Amino acid sequence: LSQAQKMQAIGQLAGGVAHDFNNLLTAIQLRLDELLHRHPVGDPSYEGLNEIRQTGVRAADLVRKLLAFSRKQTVQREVLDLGELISEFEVLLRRLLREDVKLITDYGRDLPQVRADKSQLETAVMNLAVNARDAVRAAKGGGVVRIRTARLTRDEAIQLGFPAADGDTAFIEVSDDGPGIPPDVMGKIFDPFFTTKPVGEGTGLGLATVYGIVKQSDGWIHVHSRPNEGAAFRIFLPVYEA
Amino acid sequence: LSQAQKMQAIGQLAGGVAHDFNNLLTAIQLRLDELLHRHPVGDPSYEGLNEIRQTGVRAADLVRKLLAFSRKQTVQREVLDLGELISEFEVLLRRLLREDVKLITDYGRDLPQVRADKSQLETAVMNLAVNARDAVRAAKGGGVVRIRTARLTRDEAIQLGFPAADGDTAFIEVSDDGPGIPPDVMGKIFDPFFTTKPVGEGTGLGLATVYGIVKQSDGWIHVHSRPNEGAAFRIFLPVYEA
Numbered sequence: 065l066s067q068a069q070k071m072q073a074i075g076q077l078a079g080g081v082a083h084d085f086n087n088l089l090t091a092i093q094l095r096l097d098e099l100l101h102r103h104p105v106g107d108p109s110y111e112g113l114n115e116i117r118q119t120g121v122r123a124a125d126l127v128r129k130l131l132a133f134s135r136k137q138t139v140q141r142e143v144l145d146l147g148e149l150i151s152e153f154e155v156l157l158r159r160l161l162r163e164d165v166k167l168i169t170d171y172g173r174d175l176p177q178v179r180a181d182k183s184q185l186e187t188a189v190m191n192l193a194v195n196a197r198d199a200v201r202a203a204k205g206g207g208v209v210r211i212r213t214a215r216l217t218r219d220e221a222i223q224l225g226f227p228a229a230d231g232d233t234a235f236i237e238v239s240d241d242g243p244g245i246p247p248d249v250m251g252k253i254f255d256p257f258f259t260t261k262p263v264g265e266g267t268g269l270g271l272a273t274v275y276g277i278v279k280q281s282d283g284w285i286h287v288h289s290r291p292n293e294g295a296a297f298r299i300f301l302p303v304y305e306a
Numbered sequence: 307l308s309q310a311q312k313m314q315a316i317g318q319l320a321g322g323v324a325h326d327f328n329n330l331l332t333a334i335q336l337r338l339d340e341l342l343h344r345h346p347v348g349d350p351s352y353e354g355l356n357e358i359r360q361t362g363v364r365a366a367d368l369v370r371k372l373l374a375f376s377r378k379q380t381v382q383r384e385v386l387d388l389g390e391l392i393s394e395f396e397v398l399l400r401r402l403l404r405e406d407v408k409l410i411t412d413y414g415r416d417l418p419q420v421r422a423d424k425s426q427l428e429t430a431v432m433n434l435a436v437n438a439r440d441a442v443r444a445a446k447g448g449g450v451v452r453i454r455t456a457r458l459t460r461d462e463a464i465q466l467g468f469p470a471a472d473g474d475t476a477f478i479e480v481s482d483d484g485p486g487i488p489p490d491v492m493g494k495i496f497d498p499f500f501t502t503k504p505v506g507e508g509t510g511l512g513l514a515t516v517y518g519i520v521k522q523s524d525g526w527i528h529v530h531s532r533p534n535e536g537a538a539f540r541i542f543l544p545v546y547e548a
């Protein structure tokens with residue numbers, strides 16, 4: 065879980081980099097094949113652009129083959145009671161908060177069955193919690209983290225965050241009383257290695273891990289957060305039956 | 307060991323790619339800053355080269371931060387008896403050969419103490435063995451893998467393979483009766499993801515793993531092999547005392 069779950073993080077970062085990287089790479093390929101058309105065989109600039117083109121084909125290939133390997137990781141999708149899951153999380157959740165941070169937990173009606181890798185959801189939810197914990201250091205006394213497990217019908221899902229709800233849906237939400245996330249950053253936030261926290265503190269690994277896990281679990285994740293009025297990360301998973 | 311040692315491989319590939327990649331990247335940077343000097347602000351080609359330059363600064367950074375994370379892995383350097391190590395390896399070595407492949411094992415005099423991660427050397431030696439096993443499928447009946455644990459004085463080391471021997475030195479060697487490795491390829495052989503074996507079979511992971519482990523262990527690795535007269539991979543580690 066610090067060894068087996070570092071292996072896990074590598075999976076989810078490798079998957080996200082692969083996405084960012086390949087988009088960048090396309091930008092580069094477009095531009096370079098454009099320059100090659102401008103400055104072909106005869107031009108002094110052709111050799112330099114070609115050498116770059118072919119040396120880039122090589123550097124990209126290594127990266128592609130590494131990322132692809134660096135994912136190839138294993139998951140046990142269990143049927144899990146959603147409530148029973150969070151009740152056992154409560155203990156670590158209590159462990160890492162303490163100090164001041166008031167914690168309030170809120171279990172809804174008719175709490176659904178959900179298909180997922182248990183150890184993954186643990187991490188997902190812990191990453192969110194730790195995030196919420198650092199987001200309220202400033203209030204000392206104010207800080208107030210709130211996690212809200214619940215059911216949701218297709219309609220209740222859409223307004224809460226998830227546009228593409230087929231039918232019923234399971235819902236987790238780690239809220240907080242922090243400063244919130246400015247619009248400037250809200251887009252870049254699950255980006256691998258993105259952080260506002262300084263060099264030695266921040267890594268930018270956490271939410272890429274979360275994003276990957278949610279996506280990995282047939283799931284949608286969505287945030288609403290205003291400036292000054294605290295963050296709130298919400299996870300949506302499909303309900304299970306058989 | 308299939309989970310904990312996939313994590314291990316990621317370490318050693320990430321470390322090797324990092325090396326190859328950074329060399330490629332330099333080639334590209336040289337050429338691109340040259341083109342920017344040729345075609346500056348005013349030139350139509352300046353925008354395309356700059357856009358490429360800055361989008362490349364971004365794609366490289368992700369890769370750098372991933373590789374650097376993707377290594378950060380853990381090792382227990384034990385003092386290990388060199389002979390006692392290989393005797394327990396004999397069992398897996400016997401496991402994976404069988405069929406035809408004649409095996410001969412050869413334990414030298416005064417068999418030294420060596421400082422290393424046990425599970426790593428297991429893998430290193432298994433990767434070599436599996437390699438030797440596939441390298442003699444063609445003789446059916448001929449194939450003959452030979453592993454040769456032994457001591458070596460500084461001089462005996464130099465002629466066997468290792469130029470930079472301080473003093474005494476521990477020596478492992480997995481030889482075979484295969485076709486050998488042509489000069490064309492001998493350079494590219496520990497390169498991450500390099501293989502001659504076709505797409506579905508080969509991965510090119512094995513010897514990058516080995517190279518990394520040897521280097522990881524204050525160690526030198528060297529091969530002599532002629533065309534037609536079978537491969538022979540040799541590992542040199544420093545002897546231990548305290």
Ligand SMILES: Nc1ncnc2c1ncn2[C@@H]1O[C@H](COP(=O)(O)OP(=O)(O)O)[C@@H](O)[C@H]1O
Nearest residue numbers: 195196199242259260266267268269270271295
């Ligand atoms: N609950 C929150 N409140 C305010 N800002 C947040 C919260 N969670 C995440 N962020 C912002 O999003 C960034 C990305 O999160 P993460 O991937 O965990 O980075 P880090 O690991 O450095 O915190 C953080 O660096 C932070 O700037």
Ligand SMILES: Nc1ncnc2c1ncn2[C@@H]1O[C@H](COP(=O)(O)OP(=O)(O)O)[C@@H](O)[C@H]1O
Nearest residue numbers: 437438441484501502508509510511512513537
């Ligand atoms: N004992 C050997 N005899 C002949 N060729 C070898 C031997 N060991 C390695 N090679 C060559 O070196 C390449 C690299 O080895 P490795 O990294 O294990 O690649 P792979 O995993 O595909 O075998 C092999 O693909 C093969 O072409």
Ligand SMILES: [Mg+2]
Nearest residue numbers: 191194195270
């Ligand atoms: Mg975090």
Ligand SMILES: [Mg+2]
Nearest residue numbers: 433436437512
């Ligand atoms: Mg191999």
